[PDB]
Design a protein around this ligand. Structure first.
Ligand SMILES: [Zn+2]
Ligand SMILES: [Zn+2]
Ligand SMILES: [Zn+2]
Ligand SMILES: [Zn+2]
Ligand SMILES: [Zn+2]
Ligand SMILES: [Zn+2]
Ligand SMILES: [Zn+2]
Ligand SMILES: [Zn+2]
Lengths: 458, 458, 458, 458
């Protein structure tokens, strides 16, 4: 059993000093003097905050790339998540047009199975819609996966055409599934990439211009129109800039059931990072690209008002040696920045401690809303009797810095090297079991489990 | 002591089956199968929801009109509120330019003292800014009133000119006060009023065109600009229409600390009700006016996304005989529609039961966010250990209709006559004491207390 | 030679009383009291306006539908045009995906050759992009056709997918060609069509909801984004509604070289006309559909400010018997409304005589700007020495009504039956030769010539 | 008499090679071989363009400032205008709240009378609306002044309050008068000025922050609302930035009869100029302030599409010694930048020659539209038989630079020092009389006359 005593409990809709007792995997009682039994593991949260475990709706653990693979395993990625206060992650399951979807699902599941320190689930990529698709997706959804992922990008590999998007969305609606979507334009990006390379513009600084804000804005609007016409519910992944936010907001305002995620690098990093030349720039190549810094205030301001629903990472780690596969052409740089371990600390620090983000909006944006949208609430995402005992005792007196020298992610650079932090998770629990204590990793191999969900969005 | 057992507890961020025990005035413990001392008021909430007491941030109880007065007293109004599931109301304290501000506040405070069945507080109207009034306002703030009310309307009686508005906002920011604001344009309303009357256009149907959406849009944008330049935090009361929403939203999007209230008649009633002729139309005269029905969808959609932060009533009850003071000129009709008792049932029915509003957004919009914004949280607005035991056991199986024949508000008409509802409160408590039991009123005279709040917005 | 004396000359940028003399085909001199050789056709324009011949940038003359054809020939259509004050028309040359593009152009050219009473040119439809067609298009351009037409609609028959659209735009930019575009969404229209029919919703009233404003908005935004990325110049044909206007306007505001056409039925007719049932409704079926009447004000207001650049017709005449090919399914109704003869009188009446449209904006929107955009200026579109002596002596004192009983278009209904008009052409000339005299047709068969234009938009 | 032969005549709606003959003050004939009489002054325009005389709708000649006066007289200012190709200017007649309006009008008229080299007129400032105003304004308007000027700025000196603005606009509408307006906010600017000075922020770099874009956007929207409510027609002077353009465009789109002027410094200069320190910065202090450079593309793009109707200068010259009156406080820097002589050359060069502005839009924006809006067309603003023979023979082969060393404005600095030009006026005529020949000044003292106009906008 677990007793977290003397802490200040903070959720999206509560802030109070009381103790929390969990007999086993779920919270059993909250109050004063709980009378825990002999043998209970007791955590003294005096002077600290007790938050719901944080939830990252957007990560990449297993991911092939051209001739290689991203760096985290389920083991290394879940450890890194927990150290950062993230107790549930949702991975993009990404079979390509060339792969069988159901085989893909099964392959991802097999990688994670028994190998995660914390709970997890998947969004299912629909990278084509052919005569076999519907039956396979129906099997995946009935297996507990209540979200799809589509790409309006990556022509012939992940992108879906308008007919396929229509079919996907109509099936999602019939199934109650939420459609997450990467919103660019496959044709425009591919053509601009090719034109730029044909002019000898090969370095990393041409990535951003190959897929400018206008392209993300067109795809975000297109997705919204297709949700509106089909009746499906959707979720825009990694929204990066003002034109896209305007398109998604206009859809929200007119009644489209559309939600918005932004990811941490777009709040804190900007397009000049990718203008640094060489491998230093390649570290900062992701899609959508880092943008003009003017977009940061726009995202922060929108987050503070709840216009942006969730904050994820689009965690996608590669070693510098892998980055350098793009030395001759920017199109060959594996895209991604790592961030799974640093999301909470970065949001707390630059939002709550130094910014204008309210602590309640912070909990909602980094835990609760994502749980709600993806069918993990109320098991996950809050602090209440009956919910999973996934808890973070957070130290607001902690001062430090982020660095690759102290990170757990299985690569060789940190995207926030040298950034100051104003707090950290002291203790982190997964279903009543302590996985981080005094800031140190003490997780149990395979303790995490796949979360199966019931579709909600008919 | 109080024990609410076997209910499904629903807050803005939680949903679970457990019991709640309050030894006295505040929640003491939450857990499954709690024990309570003999003699405890045990409430069996099987099959029902348990919500935080709802909170109406915008009512009028005492309010002079010519040589009469709005109809509810603190006693009638607070009883009505409770019957409807509202356990805290915030009343607009409204001395005019021709009244002394401190004498007005003391008069309002004197009316409520010992006469409310539930807790309450005030927003202080600033109907002029000058040396005496400023000193007055400073003492009112120190007495725990942490919000002001200004009017961009009602020239020479309640409205403030630009200099007054700037001075008011600056003072609010000095004092950490949030400014609530009625946003029209005092000049344009008065000129259109006078023009229409000059044309013999005297009937109630001319009230809306005397103050069209354009004027609300301008006032809302003006207020936002003033908040933006002064640094003050503000709250748009009773936002009724799309052009006003667009103005407020643009301000939110660019970082102004501005929040949005809408009131229940603007969700459910439309301008044609005020076109019915005679006293029947007069029943539906309020400011801002009921609008073209197209605005309802706009408001519901914005509410579902959290763009609108709170739902209040602008409760302002008059008898039909008093409405008829305006028989000869629409400008002489006492403005207002009653709604304090019906808000929660209406929002629950048309939003949650029949609409697209999520139950969690419902709780946030009808209780929690108002508590947060006005300094009542966490005492009010949520269910957590330590919070005032202001609770509603709500029956989602109730079916019925609203009628003047069954209302508690002390006037002779209901604006929502005949409207179906899909739920009602069964039990309602105030600080651990049951005020409504099995749908019957059992409140204790004067049990409610004035809530004093601390400055939050420096 | 021709002498038009004593008229009030009105162009987009001039308004004066003087005479115009043309020795032959072109304006030779302008001045007060000009002398002309004996035998001159002297036209006394006292009391009347003299305008540049009007120019319709969007008509259909030859157009197959199933095993029939739209009703006007080049002879009937050009006569109708002239009677209405239109001295140049631009016809959409529309071979389908299943037709050879060059054979289509040669067929269209062959239909018009020697059969037009006034000058004319074409926009070339690109209904597919592939190696053969591209070569074809290049020869058509070289023959003087400096505009293309694409369709974001009509899947598999006329529409282009994204790759085709990008290739088309890129070719246009290479060749200095302007792309005109019908902006809907081919997927969404086809799916909604099929869904509605599956529900037994077969009548004409289901045509509008099969292709709602949302779909036009999406296509207009998509086209704009494609122009923006390709560098091509473009022109939105028949823009019908506010959300489409907003998309096109946002593109204009951010610098895209995009222009906007609206057509006369969308100014004056609304969706309820297509809700009349039966053949009566079928008369009013066109694409994009007639819209909610709220859009009329939007279009008039935008026209008065020059936000809409040109007014055309989308003239596309069918007999009622042909409309009835759609008796069993709205998808089988031949789309189109006639208007070539009535455009100018309608715009003049409802805009200038009765509305808020300035006479100078009228001339620009109905003649000059179309000439500019399509490479016909300064030969066409204005009154100046050197310009083709294509002139309209317009009687602003005429009062009458439009009727099928008096029309020249070769079908059996007028969409504007009974509409009042407040002016008509008295005299109309084509290259110095009078075609309409005292309101009577006196044109010379085959006098009109194909206009060849030079590339302008590299 | 005057004959301009061999030129390429370019107006907003014509481009052709022909000759122009004027017997006296107006164009008499246009054609080839005009047969001018003995004694005619002949201008050989071979290889050059012939444009309508350009028109500056916004200048300051006589203008008091705190204890001094702007530098141009009617003599020096009109000479400078003509050298730059501007043959008509419209001066802001600016009596303050402390002055009698009719006395002001009379004073301005007396300064100009007999002292201008070219034609001119005034906009009448309405700096208060009291019991004498209406009669005085009615006398001014009946004297030929068909435009007013109002200020939403300069509290207690030029600014009008909402009641005064309402009265002004309603009288304008009754009279058919167009209301030009400086759109900021008097309260916000004054309060921010004072706050900044109170913090020791005194240098010129604090001017822009004292009246940021948001304030211009609020005033532009307010003005638009008041035009919409009163029914008056308006014209936004010197619109400088995107937020303001958005407000004015939204009003245009919804049907408000509102027009937009921008002035040349806001196309070509930016806020960093005023950050240079010292008198160098003070040279670039005007109101509205130079803005972030991002606004330039926004204005150019809007101009190219006709969203911005006119280009003026807000010519307002002061010597550097006068600028230095603001050495201790930025509020004491006389505001203004000179530009009357350089407007055309700057627009031609950076718009037509090096930019994307079409030559027709250039003529419209710099001549024709302003003539139309202010009742000077068709006497002024175009090239047609009967119009005043105000003509510019412009040399497109001229290459040079702008400098104070070669300027005619009666001050000691040029705001475009060192800017390259790609053309210049070779010959300029006023009502048939040559005022500039071979680029040299040959004007006749007092040849210019006051233009009286008939109101148009009821
Ligand atoms: Zn992605
Ligand atoms: Zn991703
Ligand atoms: Zn109010
Ligand atoms: Zn109120
Ligand atoms: Zn079409
Ligand atoms: Zn067409
Ligand atoms: Zn000004
Ligand atoms: Zn000025």
């Amino acid at each position: 059993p677990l007793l977290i005593k003397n802490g200040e409990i903070i959720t999206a809709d509560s802030r109070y000093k009381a103790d929390i007792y969990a007999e086993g995997e779920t919270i059993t009682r909250i109050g004063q003097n709980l009378e825990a039994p002999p043998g209970t593991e007791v955590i003294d949260a005096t002077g600290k905050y007790v938050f719901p475990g944080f939830i990252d709706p957007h990560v990449h653990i297993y991911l092939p790339f051209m001739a290689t693979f991203a760096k985290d395993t389920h083991e290394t990625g879940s450890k890194a998540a927990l150290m950062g206060g993230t107790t549930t992650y949702i991975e993009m399951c990404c079979p390509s047009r060339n792969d069988d979807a159901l085989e893909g699902y099964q392959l991802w599941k097999s990688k994670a199975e028994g190998n995660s320190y914390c709970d997890y689930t998947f969004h299912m990529a629909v990278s084509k819609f052919d005569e076999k698709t519907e039956g396979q997706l129906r099997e995946i959804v009935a297996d507990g996966i209540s979200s799809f992922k589509i790409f309006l990008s990556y022509k012939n590999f992940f992108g879906v055409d308008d007919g396929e998007m229509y079919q996907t969305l109509r099936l999602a609606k019939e199934l109650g599934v939420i459609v997450t979507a990467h919103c660019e334009n496959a044709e425009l990006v591919g053509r601009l990439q090719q034109k730029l390379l044909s002019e000898g513009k090969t370095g990393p600084e041409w990535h951003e211009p190959s897929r400018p804000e206008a392209v993300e804005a067109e795809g975000t609007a297109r997705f919204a129109t297709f949700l509106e016409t089909t009746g499906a519910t959707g979720y825009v992944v990694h929204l990066s800039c003002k034109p896209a936010l305007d398109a998604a907001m206009a859809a929200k305002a007119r009644g489209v059931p559309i939600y918005i995620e932004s990811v941490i690098p777009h709040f804190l990093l900007d397009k000049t990072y990718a203008e640094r030349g060489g491998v230093e720039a390649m570290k900062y190549i992701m899609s959508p690209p880092l943008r003009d810094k003017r977009n940061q205030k726009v995202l922060w301001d929108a987050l503070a008002q709840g216009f942006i629903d969730t904050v994820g990472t689009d965690h996608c780690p590669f070693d510098t040696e892998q980055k350098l596969l793009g030395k001759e052409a920017f199109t060959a740089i594996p895209n991604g920045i790592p961030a799974i371990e640093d999301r909470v600390n970065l949001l707390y620090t630059y939002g709550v401690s130094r910014g204008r983000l309210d602590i309640h909006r912070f909990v909602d944006a980094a835990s609760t809303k994502a749980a709600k949208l993806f069918g993990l609430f109320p098991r996950k995402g809050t602090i209440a009797v009956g919910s999973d005992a996934d808890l973070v005792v957070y130290d607001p007196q902690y001062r430090g810095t982020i660095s690759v020298k102290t990170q757990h992610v299985n690569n060789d650079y940190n995207g926030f090297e040298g950034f100051e932090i104003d707090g950290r998770p002291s203790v982190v629990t997964v279903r009543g079991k302590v996985a981080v204590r005094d800031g140190q990793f003490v997780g149990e191999k395979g303790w995490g489990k796949l979360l199966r969900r019931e579709p909600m969005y008919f």
